[PDB]
Each structure stands twice: as structure tokens, then as C-alpha cells.
Amino acid sequence: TQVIVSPNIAAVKQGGQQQFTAYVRATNAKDHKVVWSVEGGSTGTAITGD
Amino acid sequence: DEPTSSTGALTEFVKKMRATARKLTLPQGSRDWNSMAVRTRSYMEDLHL
Amino acid sequence: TFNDVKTSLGITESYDIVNAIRNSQGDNFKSYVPLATANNVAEVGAGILINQTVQNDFITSLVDRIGLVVIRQVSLNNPLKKFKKGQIPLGRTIEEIYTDITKEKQYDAEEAEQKVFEREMPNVKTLFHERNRQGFYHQTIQDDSLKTAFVSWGNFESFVSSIINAIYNSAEVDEYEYMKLLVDNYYSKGLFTTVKIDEPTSSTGALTEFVKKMRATARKLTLPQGSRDWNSMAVRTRSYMEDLHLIIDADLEAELDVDVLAKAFNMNRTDFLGNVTVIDGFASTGLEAVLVDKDWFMVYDNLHKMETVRNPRGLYWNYYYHVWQTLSVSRFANAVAFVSGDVPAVTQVIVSPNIAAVKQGGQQQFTAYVRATNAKDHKVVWSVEGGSTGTAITGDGLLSVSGNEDNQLTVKATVDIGTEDKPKLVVGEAVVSIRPNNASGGAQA
Known part of the structure; x- marks a missing residue:
């Protein structure tokens, strides 16, 4: 039904790294896969898996 | 889910907490929470988390 | 005395505000352009260091006087003096004793017939503090030559008082640096219980993830049943919430503050x-x-002595203010250092009472207490480095010495972390002396 992202508001230092956590809110326990992405910013600003 | 795993899993734990603690203290009681399965009733001043 | 000098003496002068700039551009320096005496204010308006005898502007034979003397006074206080615990006149060493809990046995009346007078030793760990610093603050005041430098008696005394307050400030400056040094000693020796965090300066989630580990450890330290961990001696101890002292710096406050x-x-x-x-x-x-109990500091005092001598040939006093202290750290109190960055997998391996004193042919079990930082790994590897030919520790801590065992032993509890090609070990140690048995000895059937 929805996805909740941990640290909904984040304020990260340049060069810093904030670990984010997805919380998939569901009914059937299929343990669904998350694709992480990021909008805006440079080429260097890129999210990894998890 | 583990409530320490996120903030979104934390509030989900609280909603399952407060819903359950209300069920234990309904005036009509239930069989669903003992292990002798009797219609018992708890009170809010008695529940210890 | 002094001959000529520049006015800029210790001045590096990033840019010349006087002629190279304010006279130069039509920029934001236009607010300083109409000032007529700006080239003088920019010259000596930082203060000068060497005083000339400047003549008077009209009667050139006269001189210009010092119109005011501003003696400025500072009072320096140790922020950690509330952790100081007393004074020792006589003696050097402190014997801090902890007694620990023991183990239950089962009730059995039939076995109790023959084991009335059996004995069971208590579980007592002790540690030791001894006197650390011995220093003095030399100061010399030559009162009679200093009368040439003042005109008021009220300024002469307020200056000679100030030099007496140059020590008693330095005795508070250096005492503070020594009480910070006990913290960094205790971290360098690897004895805090490190809670791995992120650097809170980077992300505000990493700040807010740090407040959670702060309040949890504070609640964990003060659980009424106590806890075996969180200290270096690994005993069950219980902290009081009014006795926890969180020692942060000024930057980490303003992170939490803003x-x-x-x-x-x-x-x-x-x-x-x-x-x-x-x-x-x-x-x-x-x-x-660093989140500590107030019993963590074992700072005591030994001497606060101001001893004076007067040279009568040259009219001065020497002020030797001696400070002797015992600056140390209890390990029976429990202490947590929230270290950001990368920390090792295992910080220390705490072992059993490290004074075992086992008779020949006796046994002793040695309990390892691994201070792991992250979650789980790390089986303990045991070792009997020391005497041999009979001395053999098991996979648990049983020692089982010998009949022939004489030399003291070093029971090691080894934990392998890191790379299999360069195995970094965290080796906790325990000592045991071997006293002779003298019965059931010699030869045997």
C-alpha cells in the first residue's frame, strides 16, 4: 500500500553518507524488492543499494 | 517487524501495541490471549509491558 | 633600553588597508574614505608593543605621560574539580576492593550430611591506584625593582597580587589537562566500552541515531539489577542516574542544541x-x-604547599608552589566512550580474576568476557603460555596444572578478528602462581 523511508527528513553533510531504510508496508509477506533512487543533484551524488 | 530496524517499523510496532492493549481490556473479554482459553478481562492498571 | 622600531612589529599584514586599499578602489571601502585621521587610526590602533618617549606637540622639551594603567585580571577554574575526591597525607597506594556476587547451589539433605564445613571462596577483584604527578610552579617576584614601574600604590599591589594569581591559575590549567589525560589514557589503553556510532556532525540522522544510543546506554547503566558489562573489570555493578556524567565537547552540544x-x-x-x-x-x-559514573575518577591530593625563600642580596622572593596528586581512574565504575569512525571488532577480552594462585594438581576455570563492539562473532581461543609438561587449558577455561608445575603461568584468551592472512588478535591475559601440593606426591602407583 505504501513505502516509508527512514530519516524522511535528512540533512547530510557534503561528502557525508546517510544510511536510509525502506519500510515496505504490505499485506502478503512476499518481502518485496526496493529500488533506491535520488532526484536532483550532481553525477557524484549517487545512491547505492540498501 | 523489528522496531529497531527503522522508524517506519517503530510506529508500526506501537500501533500493534496499543491495539493489543485495548483488546486485553475490553469489557466483554476474550478467549484469545490466555492459554487456558477462558473469557477473562484485563484492566489497564494491571497490564505490564 | 630601546632604539627605533617599526610600529608593525609582529604584524603579518594580509593586506595594507591604509594606502594600498582604502586610497585605491571605489569599492565597499568608501565608508572609510572621508575620514581625515584614518591613516593614524589604522597605524597604531591595534596597540603598540614598544613605547617611545614621544615628545609634546607644542613644547618640544616636554614629554607625554601615561594617562592610565589597565591591569587586567583573569580567574581560571577547573571545570572538573567536582570530580575530585579528597586528600592523602601518608601513603602512596589506594586499594579499591570490589566484592562480586556468587553462584547458587541446590538444596539436598542427603548430601548436606557430609558437606557442612565445606568452603567456598568469595569473588573479589581489587585494583590499585598510586601517586602520579609531582610538580611545582616556580615564580619569582622582585618587589623593589618593580616600584620603578608604577606610580600608584594601588596599582603596585594589584600587580604583585596578579603574579600570585599567575600560579593558582596555572595550577588549575594543568590540573584540567591532566584530568583530560586520564580519559585519553583510558581510551588509548583500550579500556572504555566503546559504543560504535557515526560522526554526528555529518548527517542529522547520524546525530539523532546518536541520541538513541546515548539514552539507551544511560538507561542500561542504571538498571537496578546492574549489569556485568560496561566496565573494564567486568563485575555486576549498578549506576545511579544522578551519578552519570556525560562529557561532551562544545561542538557536539551545538549539534544537539541547534x-x-x-x-x-x-x-x-x-x-x-x-x-x-x-x-x-x-x-x-x-x-x-564519554559517559562515566562519578566514581570513575580517583583524583586525590597529596600536597598543596607554597614555599617561599627570600634572596636578601638581590631583593626578590621565590614562590615554589608544589602540587602532588594521585590522578587515576577506577575501573570498578562503568564508563562508555561513544567513538565515531571505524573501531575494531573486539576492543578487549576481559578474563577471570587474574590472580588465581592454584595448587599443583588443582583446577581453575577462567571466564572470558569479550567486549565486542558490533553484534556477534568471536569464539575465544585459550592458551597456557608459561610453564608446561602437564599444564593444559581446555576449550573452556579449566587450567588443570600438574604435579610438576612450578613457574607462574600466563592464561591467554585469544580472539582472532580481521584478515586470515594477517590475523589481528585481541589477547586478554590472566596470571596464576603455582603453589606446591606436598601430598599425593613424589612417585605414584
Whole structure:
């Protein structure tokens, strides 16, 4: 039904790294896969898996 | 889910907490929470988390 | 005395505001353009260091006088003096004793017939503090030559008083640096219980993830049953919430102050839960927010002695203010250092009472207490380095010495972390002396 992202508001230092956590809110326990992405910013600003 | 795993899993734990603690203290009681399965009733001043 | 000098003496002068700039551009320096005496104010308006005898502008034979003397006074106080615990006149060493809990046995009346007078030793760990610093603050005041430098008696006394307050400030400056040094000693020796955090300066989630580990450890330290961990001796001990002292620096306050509190409708729920004190130090790397019991500090005193001599040939006094202290750290109190950055997998392996004193042919079990930082790994590897030919420790800590065992032993509890090609070990150690048996000895059937 929805996805909740941990640290909904984040304020990260340049060069810093904030670990984010997805919380998939569901009914059937299929343990669904998350694709992480990021909008805006440079080429260097890129999210990894998890 | 583990409530320490996120903030979104934390509030989900609280909603399952407060819903359950209300069920234990309904005036009509239930069989669903003992292990002798009797219609018992708890009170809010008695529940210890 | 002095001959000529420049006015800029210790001045590096990033840019010349006087002629090279204010006379030069039509820029933001236009507010200083109409000032007629600006080239004088920019010259000596920082203060000068060498005083000339400037003549008078009209009667050139006259001189210009010092119109005011501003003796400026400072009072320097140790922020950690509330952790100081007393004074020792006689003696050097402190014997801090902890007694620990013991193990239950089962009731059985039939076995109790023959084991009335059986004996069971208590579990007592002790540690030791001894006197550390011996220093003095030499100062010399030559009162009679200093009468040439003043005109008022009220300024002469306020200056000679100030030099007496140059020591008693330095005795408070150096005592503070020694009480910070006990923290960084205790981290360098690897004895805090490190809670791995992120650097709170980077992301505000990493700040808010740090407040959670702060309040948890504070609640964990003060559980009424106590806890075996959180100290270096590994005993069950219980802290009081009024006795926890969170020692942060000034930057980590303003992170909590601007970010966390400013935006907290309920201030007491993200509070640090300690008696927060502020430093500007910890000196090492990643170390911050040391959360200790007040019994952690074992700072005692030995001598506060101001001893004076007067040279009568040259009219001066010497002021030797001796300070002798016992600056040390209890390990029976429990202490947490929230270290950001990368910390090892295992910080220390605490072992059993390290004074076992086992008879030949006897046995002794040695309990390892691994201070792991992250979650889980790390089976302990045991070792009997020391005497041999009979001395053999098992996979648990049983020693089982010998009949022939004479030399003291070094029971090692080894934990392998890291790379299999360069195995970094965290080796905890325990000592045991071997007293002779003298019965069931010699030869045997």
C-alpha cells in the first residue's frame, strides 16, 4: 500500500553518507524488492543499494 | 517487524501495541490471549509491558 | 633600553588597508574614505608593543605621560574539580576492593550430611591506584625593582597580587589537562566500552541515531539489577542516574542544541539524561561523549604547599608552589566512550580474576568476557603460555596444572578478528602462581 523511508527528513553533510531504510508496508509477506533512487543533484551524488 | 530496524517499523510496532492493549481490556473479554482459553478481562492498571 | 622600531612589529599584514586599499578602489571601502585621521587610526590602533618617549606637540622639551594603567585580571577554574575526591597525607597506594556476587547451589539433605564445613571462596577483584604527578610552579617576584614601574600604590599591589594569581591559575590549567589525560589514557589503553556510532556532525540522522544510543546506554547503566558489562573489570555493578556524567565537547552540544532541541516539542525526551559537562578536547580520533559514573575518577591530593625563600642580596622572593596528586581512574565504575569512525571488532577480552594462585594438581576455570563492539562473532581461543609438561587449558577455561608445575603461568584468551592472512588478535591475559601440593606426591602407583 505504501513505502516509508527512514530519516524522511535528512540533512547530510557534503561528502557525508546517510544510511536510509525502506519500510515496505504490505499485506502478503512476499518481502518485496526496493529500488533506491535520488532526484536532483550532481553525477557524484549517487545512491547505492540498501 | 523489528522496531529497531527503522522508524517506519517503530510506529508500526506501537500501533500493534496499543491495539493489543485495548483488546486485553475490553469489557466483554476474550478467549484469545490466555492459554487456558477462558473469557477473562484485563484492566489497564494491571497490564505490564 | 630601546632604539627605533617599526610600529608593525609582529604584524603579518594580509593586506595594507591604509594606502594600498582604502586610497585605491571605489569599492565597499568608501565608508572609510572621508575620514581625515584614518591613516593614524589604522597605524597604531591595534596597540603598540614598544613605547617611545614621544615628545609634546607644542613644547618640544616636554614629554607625554601615561594617562592610565589597565591591569587586567583573569580567574581560571577547573571545570572538573567536582570530580575530585579528597586528600592523602601518608601513603602512596589506594586499594579499591570490589566484592562480586556468587553462584547458587541446590538444596539436598542427603548430601548436606557430609558437606557442612565445606568452603567456598568469595569473588573479589581489587585494583590499585598510586601517586602520579609531582610538580611545582616556580615564580619569582622582585618587589623593589618593580616600584620603578608604577606610580600608584594601588596599582603596585594589584600587580604583585596578579603574579600570585599567575600560579593558582596555572595550577588549575594543568590540573584540567591532566584530568583530560586520564580519559585519553583510558581510551588509548583500550579500556572504555566503546559504543560504535557515526560522526554526528555529518548527517542529522547520524546525530539523532546518536541520541538513541546515548539514552539507551544511560538507561542500561542504571538498571537496578546492574549489569556485568560496561566496565573494564567486568563485575555486576549498578549506576545511579544522578551519578552519570556525560562529557561532551562544545561542538557536539551545538549539534544537539541547534538541530535536536530546537525542533523538539518535548525537550526531556531527547535530552542527554546526564549531568552534561563541556570540554574542548579528547585529543585522539572519533572519541567524544564519554559517559562515566562519578566514581570513575580517583583524583586525590597529596600536597598543596607554597614555599617561599627570600634572596636578601638581590631583593626578590621565590614562590615554589608544589602540587602532588594521585590522578587515576577506577575501573570498578562503568564508563562508555561513544567513538565515531571505524573501531575494531573486539576492543578487549576481559578474563577471570587474574590472580588465581592454584595448587599443583588443582583446577581453575577462567571466564572470558569479550567486549565486542558490533553484534556477534568471536569464539575465544585459550592458551597456557608459561610453564608446561602437564599444564593444559581446555576449550573452556579449566587450567588443570600438574604435579610438576612450578613457574607462574600466563592464561591467554585469544580472539582472532580481521584478515586470515594477517590475523589481528585481541589477547586478554590472566596470571596464576603455582603453589606446591606436598601430598599425593613424589612417585605414584
